[PDB]
């Protein structure tokens, strides 16, 4: 039989969405004054983001000339090209007297393409995929080796940023692959630990590890072999992190691995060599219905094992695959929400739960969403101290938002720390991570995609998720209905 908290997790696995969302709503609701402050801050963060290099203000003036003379796009553009040519006349007197969407962006590296594609064509296609992967993935990778990544840390660390490094690579298929990942992780801990040089788990850099890298065919692995084989590896790495006093974070992956990951964490927290050390980190995904129940479990685990757990709250990286897997298994429901706004509500409710127990949990709020960030900033309350919480972001996505956050108040920043997640590796380790970033950046529901859509007003972009849910409820007839285009698997 399971403990009370473990049993509650299991029972919530595929809770009906009407139920799960209805339950979260009042825990996610910000009191009116807090809601108002969160809105104003979110608005201001998002405004600066958009209007970097005057993107919006330039977009204005354009529309005016593109009307005050009655013209279309190509009309205005043509008029600019001439104006530019006229502006290149040195002397004023002389002047006065006179599938293939991002094909454009792809061209700067260099309907008729459709024929070229049909023509030019599998070893080609496989080669095309590999190079496109590298080209797009570059912006998300901090270095090829941990040494290169680390030798790059000073610039942002001196501004108050922190790092968590990820030696890319996951889902080991063979015993040999898992062993190689083990060696890579170990190597990385030695390097990060030496660089950290005693700065500790808060100020100093840490590492993020995927359990799927450390065990062959983890996706279908049984408890008995995971404990016999994976656990000693997890323990070994964590002991080494502890010797260097750096944080070590256990990544959250597919939802059917949540249970085994909790079993591993439970065992890890009771190792004698880790007594009194608070550097163990664990990620939880707010897009899961189980998330708040996992928090209750974690709170009890911190108490029983006598430590402060580092808990990274994220929304989640595997949503597309989760929906697909659930539709294939034909079960009673989904282990994740089907509307993005419900994940947002879940994240806010879970953030409140984490912030309530600062003796037991150090919350690490991973997000690139300006509203989510502003809400957490307000929910954390008055009298911030550095060890209360931190924000986190992915390299290549979070820096512009967080340049308004980490740093001095005198320089116009919020003075809250952000830990940058820093992937390290060569092209052979990049694929899976890059695909997830493509899904994240390309989704019409994602904040980073919406903020780039200048037709979407700021107020809509940073709209309160709880209010959004209640708006849906008033229109649709009940709270927390599933996405209209995502029926239950058995339907």
Ligand X SMILES: O=C(O)[C@@H]1CCCO1
Q: Could you give the 3-state DSSP secondary structure of residue 363? A: strand
Q: Which among 319, 307, 243 is positioned nearest to 281, based on CA atoms?
A: 307
Per-residue contact flags (x/-) with ligand X for residues 143 to 162, judged by CB under 6 A:
--------------------
Q: Which among 46, 39, 44 is positioned nearest to 454, based on CA atoms?
A: 46
For 204, residues 6+ apart whose C-beta sits below 8 A from its C-beta are 162, 196, 197, 198, 245, 246, 247
d(CA 255, CA 258): 5
397 scored as a contact of ligand X (CB under 6 A): no
Provide, rounded to whole angstroms, the least separation between the CB of residue 103 and ligand X: 27
Provide, rounded to whole angstroms, the least separation between the CB of residue 367 and ligand FAD: 3
Q: Which is nearer to ligand X, 41 or 350 (CB)?
A: 350
Provide, rounded to whole angstroms, the least separation between the CB of residue 394 and ligand FAD: 5
Q: Which is nearer to ligand X, 28 or 251 (CB)?
A: 251
| Candidate list 215, 421, 429, 458; residue touching ligand X; CB under 6 A | 421
| Candidate list 250, 317, 414, 481; residue touching ligand X; CB under 6 A | 317
Q: Which is nearer to ligand FAD, 440 or 464 (CB)?
A: 440
Q: Which is nearer to ligand X, 440 or 464 (CB)?
A: 440
Footprint of ligand FAD (CB under 6 A)? 251-252, 283, 285, 287, 312, 314-319, 337-340, 342-343, 366-369, 372, 392-394, 421, 440, 443, 445-447, 483
Provide, rounded to whole angstroms, the least separation between the CB of residue 475 and ligand X: 34
State the binding partner of 445 from ligand FAD, ligand X, none, CB within 5 to 8 A by kind. Answer: ligand FAD
**Bridge partners for 393 per DSSP:** 420
State the binding partner of 393 from ligand X, ligand FAD, none, CB within 5 to 8 A by kind. Answer: ligand FAD
Q: Are 406 and 386 in contact (CB under 8 A)?
A: no
The tokens for 240 are 């080494």
Provide, rounded to whole angstroms, the least separation between the CB of residue 284 and ligand FAD: 9
Distances (CA, A) of 264 to 228, 282, 291: 11, 11, 17
Q: Which is nearer to ligand FAD, 86 or 352 (CB)?
A: 352
Q: How many alpha carbons fall within 13 Å on the CB side of residue 103?
A: 9
Q: Which is nearer to ligand FAD, 399 or 470 (CB)?
A: 399
Provide, rounded to whole angstroms, the least separation between the CB of residue 396 and ligand FAD: 11
Q: Which is nearer to ligand X, 150 or 251 (CB)?
A: 251
Q: How many alpha carbons fall within 13 Å on the CB side of residue 258?
A: 27
Strands in 295-347 per DSSP E = 309-314
Q: Are 395 and 422 in contact (CB under 8 A)?
A: yes
**Alpha-carbon 165 to chain mean position:** 14
Q: Which among 15, 12, 19, 11 is positioned nearest to 481, based on CA atoms?
A: 19
Q: Are 322 and 352 in contact (CB under 8 A)?
A: no
Number of residues that bind ligand X (CB under 6 A): 5
Element housing 234 (H / E): helix 231-244
Which residues between 242 and 281 bind ligand X (CB under 6 A)? Answer: 251
433 scored as a contact of ligand X (CB under 6 A): yes
Per-residue contact flags (x/-) with ligand X for residues 434 to 463, judged by CB under 6 A:
--x---------------------------
Q: Are 33 and 321 in contact (CB under 8 A)?
A: no
Provide, rounded to whole angstroms, the least separation between the CB of residue 318 and ligand X: 8
Angle subtended at Cα 85 by Cα 83 and Cα 91, rounded to the nearest 5 degrees = 100
Binding-site ranges for ligand X (CB under 6 A): 251, 317, 421, 433, 436
């Amino acid at each position: 039989p399971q403990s009370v908290s473990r049993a509650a997790i299991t029972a919530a696995y595929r809770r009906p969405e009407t139920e799960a969302v209805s339950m979260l709503l009042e825990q996610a609701r910000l009191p009116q004054p807090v809601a108002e402050q969160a809105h104003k801050l979110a608005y201001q963060l998002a405004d600066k983001l958009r209007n970097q290099k005057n993107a919006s203000g330039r977009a204005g003036m354009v529309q005016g000339l593109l009307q005050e003379f009655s013209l279309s796009s190509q009309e205005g553009v043509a008029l600019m090209c001439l104006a530019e040519a006229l502006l290149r006349i040195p002397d004023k007197a002389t002047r006065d007297a006179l599938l293939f969407v991002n094909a454009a962006t792809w061209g700067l590296l260099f309907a008729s393409l459709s024929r070229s594609l049909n023509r030019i064509i599998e070893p080609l296609i496989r080669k095309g995929v590999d190079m496109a992967m590298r080209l797009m993935g570059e912006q998300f990778v901090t270095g090829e080796t941990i040494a290169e990544a680390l030798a790059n840390a000073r610039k942002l660390e001196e501004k108050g940023f922190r790092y968590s490094y990820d030696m890319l690579g996951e889902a080991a298929l063979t015993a040999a692959d898992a062993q190689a990942y083990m060696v890579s992780y170990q190597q990385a801990i030695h390097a990060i630990g030496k660089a950290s040089n005693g700065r500790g788990i808060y100020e100093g850099p840490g590492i993020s590890i995927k359990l799927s890298a450390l065990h062959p065919r983890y996706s279908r692995a049984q408890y008995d072999r995971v404990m016999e084989e994976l656990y000693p590896r997890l323990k070994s790495l964590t002991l080494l992190a502890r010797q260097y006093d750096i944080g070590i974070n256990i990544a959250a992956e597919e939802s059917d691995r949540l249970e085994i990951s909790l079993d591993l964490l439970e065992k890890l927290c009771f190792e004698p060599e880790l007594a009194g050390w608070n550097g163990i980190g664990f990620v939880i995904q707010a897009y899961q219905k189980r998330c708040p129940l996992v928090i209750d479990y974690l709170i009890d685990l911190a108490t029983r094992s006598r430590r402060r757990l580092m808990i990274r709250l994220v929304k989640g990286a595997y949503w597309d695959s989760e929906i697909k897997r659930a539709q294939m298994d034909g079960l009673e429901g989904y282990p994740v929400y089907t509307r993005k706004v419900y994940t947002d509500v879940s994240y806010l409710a879970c953030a409140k739960k984490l912030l309530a127990v600062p003796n037991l949990i150090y919350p690490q709020f991973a997000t690139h969403n300006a509203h989510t960030l502003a809400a957490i900033y307000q929910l954390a309350g008055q009298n911030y101290y550095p060890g209360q919480y931190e924000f986190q972001c992915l390299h290549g996505m979070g820096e512009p938002l967080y340049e308004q956050v980490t740093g001095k108040v005198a320089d116009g920043k919020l003075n809250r720390p952000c830990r940058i997640y820093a992937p390290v590796g060569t092209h052979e380790t990049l694929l899976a991570y890059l695909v997830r970033r493509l899904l994240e950046n390309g989704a019409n529901t994602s904040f980073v995609n919406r903020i780039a859509d200048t037709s979407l007003p700021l107020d809509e972009l940073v709209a309160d998720p709880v209010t959004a849910v209640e708006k849906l409820a008033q229109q649709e007839g009940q709270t927390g209905l599933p996405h209209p285009k995502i029926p239950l698997p058995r339907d």
